Amino acid sequence: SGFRKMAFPSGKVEGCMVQVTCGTTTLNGLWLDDVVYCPRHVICTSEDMLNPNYEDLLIRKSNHNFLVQAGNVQLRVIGHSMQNCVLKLKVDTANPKTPKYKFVRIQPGQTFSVLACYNGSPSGVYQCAMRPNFTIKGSFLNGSCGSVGFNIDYDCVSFCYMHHMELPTGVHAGTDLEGNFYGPFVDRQTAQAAGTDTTITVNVLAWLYAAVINGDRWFLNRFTTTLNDFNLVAMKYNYEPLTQDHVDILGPLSAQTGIAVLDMCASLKELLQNGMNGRTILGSALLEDEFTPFDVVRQCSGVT
Amino acid sequence: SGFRKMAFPSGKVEGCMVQVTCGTTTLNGLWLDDVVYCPRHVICTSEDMLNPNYEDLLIRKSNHNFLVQAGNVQLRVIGHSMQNCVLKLKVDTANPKTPKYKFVRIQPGQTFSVLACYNGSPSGVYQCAMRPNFTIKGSFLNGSCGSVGFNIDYDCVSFCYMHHMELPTGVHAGTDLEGNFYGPFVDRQTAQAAGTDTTITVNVLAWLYAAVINGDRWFLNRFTTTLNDFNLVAMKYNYEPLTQDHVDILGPLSAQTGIAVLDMCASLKELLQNGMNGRTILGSALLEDEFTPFDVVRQCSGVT
Ligand SMILES: CCC(=O)Nc1ccc(N(Cc2ccsc2)C(=O)Cn2nnc3ccccc32)cc1
Numbered sequence: 001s002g003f004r005k006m007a008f009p010s011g012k013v014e015g016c017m018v019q020v021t022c023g024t025t026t027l028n029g030l031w032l033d034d035v036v037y038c039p040r041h042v043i044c045t046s047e048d049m050l051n052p053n054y055e056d057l058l059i060r061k062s063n064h065n066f067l068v069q070a071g072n073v074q075l076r077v078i079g080h081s082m083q084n085c086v087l088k089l090k091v092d093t094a095n096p097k098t099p100k101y102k103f104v105r106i107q108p109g110q111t112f113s114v115l116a117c118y119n120g121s122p123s124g125v126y127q128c129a130m131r132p133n134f135t136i137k138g139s140f141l142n143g144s145c146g147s148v149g150f151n152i153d154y155d156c157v158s159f160c161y162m163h164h165m166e167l168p169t170g171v172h173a174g175t176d177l178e179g180n181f182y183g184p185f186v187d188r189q190t191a192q193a194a195g196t197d198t199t200i201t202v203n204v205l206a207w208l209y210a211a212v213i214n215g216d217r218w219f220l221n222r223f224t225t226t227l228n229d230f231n232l233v234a235m236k237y238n239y240e241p242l243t244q245d246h247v248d249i250l251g252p253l254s255a256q257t258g259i260a261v262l263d264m265c266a267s268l269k270e271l272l273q274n275g276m277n278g279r280t281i282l283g284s285a286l287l288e289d290e291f292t293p294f295d296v297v298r299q300c301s302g303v304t
Numbered sequence: 305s306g307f308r309k310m311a312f313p314s315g316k317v318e319g320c321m322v323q324v325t326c327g328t329t330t331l332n333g334l335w336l337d338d339v340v341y342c343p344r345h346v347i348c349t350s351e352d353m354l355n356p357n358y359e360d361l362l363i364r365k366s367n368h369n370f371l372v373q374a375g376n377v378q379l380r381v382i383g384h385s386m387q388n389c390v391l392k393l394k395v396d397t398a399n400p401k402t403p404k405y406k407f408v409r410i411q412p413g414q415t416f417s418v419l420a421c422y423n424g425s426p427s428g429v430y431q432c433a434m435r436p437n438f439t440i441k442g443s444f445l446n447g448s449c450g451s452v453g454f455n456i457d458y459d460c461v462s463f464c465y466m467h468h469m470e471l472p473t474g475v476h477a478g479t480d481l482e483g484n485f486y487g488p489f490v491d492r493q494t495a496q497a498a499g500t501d502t503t504i505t506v507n508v509l510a511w512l513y514a515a516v517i518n519g520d521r522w523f524l525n526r527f528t529t530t531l532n533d534f535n536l537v538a539m540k541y542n543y544e545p546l547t548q549d550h551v552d553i554l555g556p557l558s559a560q561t562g563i564a565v566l567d568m569c570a571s572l573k574e575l576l577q578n579g580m581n582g583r584t585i586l587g588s589a590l591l592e593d594e595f596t597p598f599d600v601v602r603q604c605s606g607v608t
């Protein structure tokens with residue numbers, strides 16, 4: 001028992017982190033097979049960051065201008081190309097530590113682990129969720145760009161995020177591993193504000209089921225609701241509207257606990273309307289939304 | 305910017321996890337050099353768990369009775385011994401993935417990362433603190449025993465915890481890597497209740513400094529206090545008494561923010577007396593105590 005914000009073991013990703021330097025800018029790269037993936041803003045100087053023309057900037061760059069170091073050894077760059085907001089540096093050596101991997105573009109509300117890196121070296125790992133406004137509430141400092149987000153299915157690593165920027169609001173924006181930004185963000189040092197950050201309702205319900213499985217039951221009530229009634233309350237509290245797809249994914253949790261999804265929604269409704277009244281759920285005084293129903297099942301069963 | 309409950313990269317520990325089986329019981333082992341460390345209750349059956357005589361139980365066991373598997377390959381056991389509550393299985397092969405390592409016994413209030421494992425395979429990593437009552441609020445299921453807690457200083461892994469049991473209260477108890485339990489716990493399935501869990505005051509203050517560094521300043525007030533006045537309030541709220549040693553370790557955080565330690569204590573005092581009033585600090589509606597001053601400095605500077 002016990003419930004924790006758990007990240008995937010980072011080992012398979014640690015073996016992929018390299019340092020990429022272009023001129024005087026150093027950031028992280030992801031070495032998979034014979035390709036190193038990194039944010040394209042590695043080619044930028046502080047002046048050409050206000051409004052950079054990456055195609056024009058990359059013209060003045062050659063393979064020898066990109067320094068790729070894996071631990072203490074230098075990789076030889078034999079090709080370079082830009083795919084959306086990422087640079088792909090072809091190296092002459094395949095990474096011997098390349099795990100089985102995939103590049104996936106995650107949906108908002110889905111969770112992933114981030115291996116924060118500096119100078120190609122890992123500093124820490126934590127669990128994140130892609131917010132409905134397509135930002136992540138991470139922990140990144142200057143030099144962390146190129147750090148990646150990922151999920152792991154037994155031996156396969158699904159890379160889903162590459163860190164590119166911090167918005168003036170302290171939230172983080174980045175791309176998938178094809179260089180496409182999540183959300184409307186551009187790799188330009190300009191006014192970019194995030195949209196309304198809504199709560200991921202299906203994840204809060206999954207976390208309420210995790211609380212029941214782990215002994216925290218005070219919030220269970222004698223009531224039920226309907227999807228339409230619940231959604232009127234979810235709208236009022238800037239919670240994502242709950243759909244039948246969401247009810248369906250909560251099915252295994254509903255079956256494990258014997259608490260119908262709509263009954264759990266009525267518990268959530270009362271918690272939204274009345275608050276926690278100074279109480280806690282799974283050691284938290286707020287409703288946690290960064291655990292998906294899959295995460296709750298995984299942690300509560302022991303998938304390695 | 306941003307503040308997260310970050311764990312150390314688990315890679316160096318993943319390469320040490322093995323599966324240990326004795327009869328019909330399987331748990332995790334830690335392979336370092338030519339020794340495999342695991343909880344001694346691996347030799348127990350469900351009957352000899354109510355009151356086990358481990359010396360008598362281990363007499364009926366030979367080197368060949370301990371099955372050690374590293375991934376898909378079997379290790380040959382050439383020696384076995386009991387050191388306090390751990391078994392040390394000498395194997396004929398040194399772990400090629402053995403990192404630079406130390407065995408340390410941590411102090412209550414100190415933090416560490418746990419790599420939760422099942423059948424010698426890692427499932428996840430999370431950050432923990434050794435509670436003042438010597439328990440950890442982890443996330444462990446049956447089969448997780450032998451999972452380890454650790455800290456990392458650049459390339460050196462300091463192992464500090466090995467998981468042994470879950471108390472009836474859902475909290476976790478375990479040993480250091482010499483087999484000595486943290487706290488008064490015994491490896492026996494008996495009534496063992498934890499003492500009062502107090503809040504780690506120095507860690508809450510460190511987390512308030514992290515909130516200031518990251519923009520959350522609403523809680524800063526126009527007041528100050530003394531160590532004796534603050535401690536009268538800390539006693540009332542079952543917070544650990546703050547000492548000059550604690551003030552000293554908060555020095556670098558106090559210097560970074562320019563907020564005197566006693567002024568921050570007065571902010572904490574008002575937060576304890578008045579509560580959060582529906583507000584949050586670093587995305588939390590309660591006072592977080594599982595970040596030490598070292599953790600805050602590390603995360604807010606980027607130590608890899
Ligand atoms: C020498 C060249 C140079 O100064 N480059 C540079 C690169 C990226 C950034 N930006 C903004 C931006 C502008 C275009 S693309 C991204 C970040 O947000 C980088 N970043 N990412 N996470 C951060 C966390 C803290 C501080 C900075 C952070 C700032 C400067």
Ligand SMILES: CCC(=O)Nc1ccc(N(Cc2ccsc2)C(=O)Cn2nnc3ccccc32)cc1
Binds near residue numbers: 328329469494
């Ligand atoms: C076949 C032999 C057998 O049944 N062994 C066994 C081993 C350990 C436990 N105990 C209690 C205990 C008694 C003596 S030493 C520890 C746990 O708390 C194991 N444990 N650790 N974390 C857990 C989390 C969930 C369930 C059980 C957990 C229970 C059973």
